[PDB]
């Protein structure tokens, strides 16, 4: 079941937040069939969405910010 582009990004932000303490986030990207499917899960809970040319712009920047700010633990 697909989620609206925006909603997707909120659930995702949430996954990361829940997995900080101790867990893992998985995000996968594949051509949908022009669109591309995007899925993410923490092991149990699973979220997905489809991003098109109609929406790549608003989405990339948002998605970009999400990944950058939430992957902090590294050296």
């Amino acid at each position: 079941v697909l989620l609206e582009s925006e909603q997707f990004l909120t659930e995702l932000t949430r996954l990361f937040q829940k997995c900080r303490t101790s867990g893992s986030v998985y995000i996968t990207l594949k051509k949908y069939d022009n669109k591309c499917l995007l899925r993410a899960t923490d092991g149990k809970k699973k979220i997905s969405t489809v991003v098109s040319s109609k929406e790549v712009n608003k989405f990339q920047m948002a998605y970009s910010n999400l990944l950058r700010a939430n992957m902090d633990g590294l050296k």
Binding site: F16, S22, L29, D33, D72, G73, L74
Partner: protein, 74 residues
């Protein structure tokens, strides 16, 4: 195979996706508690893998994604 530099793995990965933009898939796994990232690109027969714990990389990746996300949508 796994790669020791983002440079190689990048084209390696991009090229691989290019030779079959339909089977290929890319996954990312971040574990905050261990402080490491891990990108892998498969074909379910071929598998590329990059592992890191250097923050200097998160951007290089968020980019790669943003790059792959462009091909998939043109």
């Amino acid at each position: 195979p796994q790669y020791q530099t983002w440079e190689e793995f990048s084209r390696a990965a991009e090229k691989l996706y290019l030779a079959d933009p339909m089977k290929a898939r890319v996954v990312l796994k971040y574990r905050h508690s261990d402080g490491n990232l891990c990108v892998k690109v498969t074909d379910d027969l071929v598998c590329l893998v990059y592992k890191t714990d250097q923050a200097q990389d998160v951007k290089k990746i968020e980019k790669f994604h943003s790059q792959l996300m462009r091909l998939m949508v043109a």
